Design a protein around this ligand. Structure first.
Ligand SMILES: Nc1nc2c(ncn2[C@@H]2O[C@H](COP(=O)(O)OP(=O)(O)OP(=O)(O)O)[C@@H](O)[C@H]2O)c(=O)[nH]1
Ligand SMILES: Nc1ncnc2c1ncn2[C@@H]1O[C@H](COP(=O)(O)OP(=O)(O)CP(=O)(O)O)[C@@H](O)[C@H]1O
Ligand SMILES: Nc1nc2c(ncn2[C@@H]2O[C@H](COP(=O)(O)OP(=O)(O)O)[C@@H](O)[C@H]2O)c(=O)[nH]1
Ligand SMILES: O=C(NCCN1CCCC1=O)Nc1ccccc1
Ligand SMILES: [Ca+2]
Ligand SMILES: [Ca+2]
Ligand SMILES: [Ca+2]
Ligand SMILES: [Mg+2]
Ligand SMILES: [Mg+2]
Ligand SMILES: [Mg+2]
Lengths: 54, 438, 425, 352
């Protein structure tokens, strides 16, 4: 039951108590993912307009 | 002094952000028009509260915050609310139609078109920071904006602010206050893409905030106001170390050092006490031991689960009010003798304690009563993996039939991203069991 | 400012559409002249979802009236609330459709559709943010069925990423004008399967049986049937016309109700349904028990023959929300065998403070049930009974159609029934 | 109308409890994967406790205490007794035991040999028994070399505890036996003891000079009905119920079952359950727990009771299924979900 690193200031204090010792995607790659999904929407909508033209 | 920028995404992030900044002002003595009498340095100064507020020549204290919602109804409340004067229009960004509770809609269809705008506004705040620590991001799991747009914002922030820390405050979905059936989908989708980008995430289960309102505050049918005012008390307790003089959790880096030994397991459980109904005739003020012991009761955890059947990796006691270190250690002694607190062998069995003498500030007219001492415990327990299990199970039920998947594929998302995100969660649950169970 | 464009086509569509605007105009405090005279701010909070605001504070329904003969729309204009509709929004021909899908979809209707899209485009071009469209029509006639679906086909082509919603009156031999109604309905169902996101199925037999057995109306009329439709249409659109966060817009509604693109046909319901013992107060448990009774449902499909994929309940009136939650959970926890277990929390509930005109508190029921396949099964049998002898086909071949097109619509709806069948197990 | 699910088709006890629930007309059984249930009769292994208590409006109840495995596992019980101050290493009613890991994998190998060598020098009886939870697989030997080598041949953890060389023998027969007690702990943590117990007796005369033939040493119902040639000789199915055992203790020993054995049994039950109450109690938990336990005891010629093991998913005597299962519905299930005596239990009051 040890206390360590007691820090005291005007608005309080802090300390540690021990009971027992122990034993990313680039900007390019993010733009591709976004444009790839935008392209899949474009293709799906194209097939719908193609369907409606028939 | 180092600055902290807060970002509020979606309806949940914005309404919770509203309640927190309302509280931050009452705690620092900042009036709704931004004026702060106690601040003697007019339009400047590197004080502890200046991590969350900048200053203008007129002496206005402006929250270092950005609000983002793909629909303008929720943010218009801020534009015409009590603290409409605190913010300038640049800080409030609103689209015209939301993500329809569709992760893919918030991340891809709509997110692609507005991301560059949010980052620009965010960069404007960064340009006032002489030493930016990082970001605190408020958002929900279930919403299409909070889940879908947040994950994209986090990915870009890691590219623009590589060395900066990023913490989260995430709302875990609860059916009692949810009418979206696909929230398990969005939650697991946004946890997959954000896991490698978030340094520390405090989850709040609406189910837990809900019962605490009915049980402790005797609120028969809690509203978002009731929930958010209580949530902002916890958030206030967590962020106090950044806004006040002190030596524990003084910058965002310390949150990861003190709470996250392994990166993927970065979801500390929060437990708060006491919560007392202001409508009470008059309550008997609890002691240090009593509020400390309450930190090991499931009934006041932000996420319902059983820490007795997990293993602790870290533990922080944040006290506010009449509390001296002598009382903390005495209470801790009597809890080890009566409580099941199993630490991992590769971590010391101890507690970090911070004490701020100013007791909790309550919103005048709110539901919470003024108390002389409160505590918020931040502990990293494997027990919180129960929440991932619950959520993953619901995911499995719907996805087994591909129910609702067409709404996501229809917004340009590939079906394979579902299974990809689900396997990540299966690994996350696995990491937890490897650390806690024998 | 999420605007919805309303379109009513044909006889049935315009008479139900008329009563619908009559009912909600009263709930928003709008008089027949478009002037507001309500007493609550909640009445105008979401007023721009169905009404445009003109000079002098006038509110004009955002509705387009379509028909291939003038008759019905002359009654609307001379009706009580007729003066409220935008005169330019009356689009009508003179030949009629002779209860003929081919005339509404290919010949007579094809001649008039473009001019209807000129008005549709005009109303949409003045929307701050267009949610989507709602169409009221019958499937058993010629105009609302044939031209109605032709309009949906051409509206999707111009607004592909908006929500398309329909209130579709399905025909029944027990309440029938002509014997070709199964032909017209089978041709439209395929259109709706492809080109709508939400279709509220309304079986005229359910309306008649309710008026007869429940409401104790000796000799029901189309007007009595339309009174129910009005009240039901007002209920299902409560989410859209008042402050709320549950199913607030059409897309969010679809996202929560349509787990599969083609299975988007809903069974509506309404409680209370009392004959004139009408002044008795109705309790929350009663309101909930009735709302789920098949006799209170308007698709003439027994829900106890299928399973619910999703359910959206709306409670209107000042009541105990705590007591609403318990009764809802009680019905789910008392009959969980009729709800699929692979959609967690597939039953949602919403509350509204403003009750309908003349009720302390009511409840509207939107169910996406696999039992709806019985409706398409009845229509398919009636179709095949005549088509196997090619009976009455000359009406359609004479308009240019071929027998093949009938065989395909027949095969399409059988597929639809088979799709509902696999999810029932 | 309450709702419950069945996730353990192999449970004979809860197959009867479910049969009784449906017989009341007020409990509706749902599919084993429907979450909208009031009661769960869960599986034995990997019961998803984390998914309980999260359904709005449903008070949910399960038939297992999360964490009770600490008591119903051979090694777990040993570690629990030696580490729990409430039980202490000097526990007088639990045979001296040790946890021994096979050498192909903490471990108490040397601690065992130390105590073993002391008995070897002190001329005292030095006969131990090696057993494990992964058994039908038991070895009784007086040589430590054979007990340790037997565990290394296995790939799971075993326990070596002192073999009761002076067990109480019944007459006629000169035969060893054991006692099975059924205990039920409700959601409030009341410890109820079933008034009816059973004695699974050995149909073979106890032999102290031959631990190889494990027919007169092991009193397991399956071993006697398979390798014992006198099965069913003295009592039906090698099962002597309390009414007969009490008459024997009076005609032979001039004592009663209550005084000589039952007081000790009740004491051991409290100390075990009370010990772990702070760890498994569901008093302030989002769901509720109750469980039925099967305690196994030994009686020596000195009329001293020793704890053998605790079974978390025990079975019941064929003759007592009706009475016991019905009781479970009264104190454990209906107490939480009431319907629209002379209790068959004995409450063991204690300080929570
Ligand atoms: N605690 C709390 N939870 C909220 C609040 N608002 C919404 N939620 C929760 O958030 C989830 C829905 O996500 P939202 O934030 O409303 O959705 P969104 O971020 O606006 O994204 P959209 O789909 O575009 O509307 C539900 O589970 C709600 O319970 C709030 O103000 N406080
Ligand atoms: N230390 C000891 N002294 C004397 N006998 C012992 C003993 N340990 C075990 N036994 C004998 O073994 C039998 C119980 O074995 P044990 O309970 O360890 O195996 P098991 O758990 O597979 C049977 P069950 O679980 O059904 O009670 C008893 O009949 C007892 O006679
Ligand atoms: N509920 C209801 N159904 C109607 C009404 N008028 C016609 N119908 C039904 O609609 C079908 C006929 O379609 P109708 O609208 O008259 O043809 P249209 O004018 O060419 O579109 C028949 O099945 C009728 O039973 C009405 O006012 N109310
Ligand atoms: O106009 C007529 N038939 C048009 C074709 N049809 C027949 C079925 C419905 C329909 O549209 N018939 C007619 C009848 C009386 C007087 C003058 C003419
Ligand atoms: Ca200053
Ligand atoms: Ca990073
Ligand atoms: Ca012509
Ligand atoms: Mg939103
Ligand atoms: Mg007609
Ligand atoms: Mg066993």
């Amino acid at each position: 039951m040890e206390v360590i690193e007691l820090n005291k200031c005007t608005s309080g204090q802090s300390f540690e108590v021990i009971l027992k010792p122990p034993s990313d995607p680039s900007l390019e790659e993010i733009q591709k993912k976004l444009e790839a999904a935008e392209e899949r929407r474009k293709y799906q909508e194209a097939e719908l307009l193609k369907h409606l033209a028939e | 002094m180092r600055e902290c920028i807060s970002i509020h995404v979606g309806q949940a992030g914005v309404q919770i952000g509203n309640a927190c900044w309302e509280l931050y002002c009452l705690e620092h003595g900042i009036q709704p028009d931004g004026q702060m009498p106690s601040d003697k340095t007019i339009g400047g100064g590197d004080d502890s509260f200046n991590t969350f507020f900048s200053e203008t020549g007129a002496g206005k204290h402006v929250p270092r915050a950005v609000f983002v919602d793909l629909e303008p109804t929720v943010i218009d409340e801020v534009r015409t609310g009590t603290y409409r004067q605190l913010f300038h229009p640049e800080q409030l960004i609103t689209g015209k139609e939301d993500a329809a509770n569709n992760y893919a809609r918030g991340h891809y269809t709509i997110g692609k078109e507005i991301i560059d705008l949010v980052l620009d506004r965010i960069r404007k705040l960064a340009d006032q920071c002489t030493g930016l620590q990082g970001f605190l991001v408020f958002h929900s799991f279930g919403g299409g904006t909070g889940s879908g747009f947040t994950s994209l914002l986090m990915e870009r922030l890691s590219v623009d602010y590589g060395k900066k820390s990023k913490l989260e405050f995430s709302i875990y979905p609860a059916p009692q206050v949810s009418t979206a059936v696909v929230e398990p989908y969005n939650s697991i989708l946004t946890t997959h893409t954000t896991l490698e980008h978030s340094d520390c995430a405090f989850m709040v289960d609406n189910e837990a905030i809900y019962d605490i309102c009915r049980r402790n505050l005797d609120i028969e049918r809690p509203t978002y106001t009731n929930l958010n005012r209580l949530i902002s008390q916890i958030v206030s307790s967590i962020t106090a170390s950044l806004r006040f003089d002190g030596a524990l959790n003084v910058d965002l880096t310390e949150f990861q050092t003190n709470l996250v030994p392994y990166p993927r397991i970065h979801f500390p459980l929060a437990t708060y006490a006491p919560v007392i109904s202001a409508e009470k005739a008059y309550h008997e003020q609890l002691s240090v031991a009593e509020i400390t012991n309450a930190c090991f009761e499931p009934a006041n955890q932000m996420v319902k689960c059983d820490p007795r059947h997990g293993k602790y990796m870290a533990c922080c006691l944040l006290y506010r009010g009449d509390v001296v270190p002598k009382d903390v250690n005495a209470a801790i002694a009597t809890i080890k003798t009566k409580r099941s607190i199993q630490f991992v062998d590769w971590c010391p069995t101890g507690f970090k304690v911070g004490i701020n003498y100013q007791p909790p500030t309550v919103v005048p007219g709110g539901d919470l009563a003024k108390v002389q001492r409160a505590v918020c415990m931040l502990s990293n327990t494997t027990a919180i993996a129960e929440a991932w299990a619950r959520l993953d199970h619901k995911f499995d039920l719907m996805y087994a039939k591909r129910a609702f998947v067409h709404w996501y594929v229809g917004e340009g998302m590939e079906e394979g991203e579902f299974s990809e995100a689900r396997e990540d969660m299966a690994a996350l649950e696995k990491d937890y069991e490897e650390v806690g169970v024998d | 400012m999420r605007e919805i464009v309303h379109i009513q086509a044909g006889q049935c569509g315009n008479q139900i559409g008329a009563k619908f605007w009559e009912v909600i105009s009263d709930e928003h405090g709008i008089d027949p002249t478009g002037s507001y005279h309500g007493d609550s701010d909640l009445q105008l909070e979401r007023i721009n979802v169905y009404y445009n605001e003109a000079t002098g504070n006038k509110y004009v329904p955002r509705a387009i009236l379509v028909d291939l003969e003038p008759g019905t729309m002359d009654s609307v204009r001379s009706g009580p609330f007729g003066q409220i509709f935008r005169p330019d929004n009356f689009v009508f021909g003179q030949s009629g459709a002779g209860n003929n899908w081919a005339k509404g979809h290919y010949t007579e209707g094809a001649e008039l559709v473009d001019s209807v899209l000129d008005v549709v485009r005009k109303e949409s071009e003045s929307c701050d943010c267009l949610q989507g469209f709602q169409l009221t029509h019958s499937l058993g006639g010629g105009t609302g069925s044939g031209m109605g679906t032709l309009l949906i086909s051409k509206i999707r082509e111009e607004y592909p990423d908006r929500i398309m919603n329909t209130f579709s009156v399905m025909p029944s031999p027990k309440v029938s004008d002509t014997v070709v109604e199964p032909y017209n309905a089978t041709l439209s169902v395929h259109q709706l399967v492809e080109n709508t996101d939400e279709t509220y199925c309304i079986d005229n037999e359910a309306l008649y049986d309710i008026c007869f057995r429940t409401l104790k109306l000796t000799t029901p009329t189309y007007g009595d049937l339309n009174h129910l439709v009005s009240a039901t249409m007002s209920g299902v659109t409560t989410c859209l016309r008042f402050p709320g966060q549950l199913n607030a817009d059409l897309r969010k509604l679809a996202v929560n109700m349509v787990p599969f693109p083609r299975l988007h046909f809903f069974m509506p319901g309404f409680a209370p349904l009392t004959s004139r013992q009408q002044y008795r107060a109705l309790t929350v448990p009663e309101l909930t028990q009735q709302m789920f009774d098949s006799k209170n449902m308007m698709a003439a499909c027994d829900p106890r023959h299928g399973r619910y994929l999703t359910v959206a309940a709306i409670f209107r009136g000042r009541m105990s929300m705590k007591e609403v939650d318990e009764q809802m959970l009680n019905v789910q926890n008392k009959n969980s065998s009729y709800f699929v277990e692979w959609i967690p929390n597939n039953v949602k509930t919403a509350v509204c403070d403003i009750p309908p005109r003349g009720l302390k508190m009511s409840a509207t029921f939107i169910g996406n049930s696999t039992a709806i396949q019985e409706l398409f099964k009845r229509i398919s049998e009636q179709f095949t009974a005549m088509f196997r002898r090619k009976a009455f086909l000359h009406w359609y071949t004479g308009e240019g159609m071929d027998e093949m097109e009938f065989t395909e619509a027949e095969s399409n709806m059988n597929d639809l029934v088979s799709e509902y069948q696999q999810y029932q197990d | 109308m309450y709702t419950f699910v069945v996730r353990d088709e192999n449970s004979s006890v809860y197959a009867e409890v479910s049969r009784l629930l449906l017989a009341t007309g007020q409990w509706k059984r749902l599919r084993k994967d429907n979450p909208r249930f009031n009661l769960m009769l869960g599986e034995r292994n990997r019961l998803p406790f984390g998914r309980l208590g999260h359904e709005p409006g449903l008070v949910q109840l399960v038939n297992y205490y999360r964490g009770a495995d600490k008591l119903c596992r051979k090694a777990s019980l040993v570690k629990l007794i030696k580490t729990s101050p409430e039980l202490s290493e000097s526990c007088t009613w639990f045979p001296e035991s040790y946890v021994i890991y096979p050498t192909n994998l903490t471990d108490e190998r040397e601690v065992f040999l130390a105590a073993y060598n002391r008995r070897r020098e002190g001329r005292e009886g030095n006969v131990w028994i090696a057993k494990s939870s992964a058994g039908a697989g038991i070895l009784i030997s007086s040589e430590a070399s054979e007990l340790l080598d037997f565990i290394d041949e296995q790939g799971q953890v075993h326990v070596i505890q002192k073999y009761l060389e002076k067990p109480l023998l019944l007459e006629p027969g000169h035969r060893k036996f054991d006692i099975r007690s059924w205990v039920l702990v409700d959601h409030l943590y009341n410890i109820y003891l079933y008034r009816e117990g059973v004695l699974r007796t050995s149909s073979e005369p106890y032999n102290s000079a031959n631990f190889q033939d494990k027919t007169c040493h092991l009193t397991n119902h399956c071993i006697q009905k398979e390798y014992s040639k006198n099965y069913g000789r003295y009592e039906e199915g090698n099962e002597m119920f309390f009414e007969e055992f009490n008459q024997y203790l009076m005609d032979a020993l001039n004592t009663t079952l209550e005084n000589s054995i039952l007081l000790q049994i009740k004491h051991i039950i409290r100390s075990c359950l009370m010990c772990i109450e702070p760890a498994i109690s569901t008093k302030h938990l989002h769901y509720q727990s109750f469980q039925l336990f099967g305690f196994d005891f030994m009686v020596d010629e000195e009329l001293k009771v020793w704890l053998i093991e605790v079974n978390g998913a025990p079975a019941c005597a064929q003759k007592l299924y009706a009475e016991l299962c019905q009781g479970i519905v009264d104190v454990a299930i209906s107490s939480v979900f009431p319907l629209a005596p002379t209790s068959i239990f004995i409450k063991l009051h204690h300080h929570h």
